Amino acid sequence: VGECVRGRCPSGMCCSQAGYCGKGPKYCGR
């Protein structure tokens, strides 16, 4: 979160095209 940690995310978060992890349209969509 913030970064996708080595490409991973914490509990149910998603990874954006920018290598940044969070929850929302640009994270779980694109």
Curated annotation (Swiss-Prot):
Cystine bridges: 4-15, 9-21, 14-28
Source species of the chain: Amaranthus caudatus (Love-lies-bleeding)
Domain called Chitin-binding type-1: residue spans: 4-28
Domain of life: Eukaryota
Protein name: Antimicrobial peptide 2
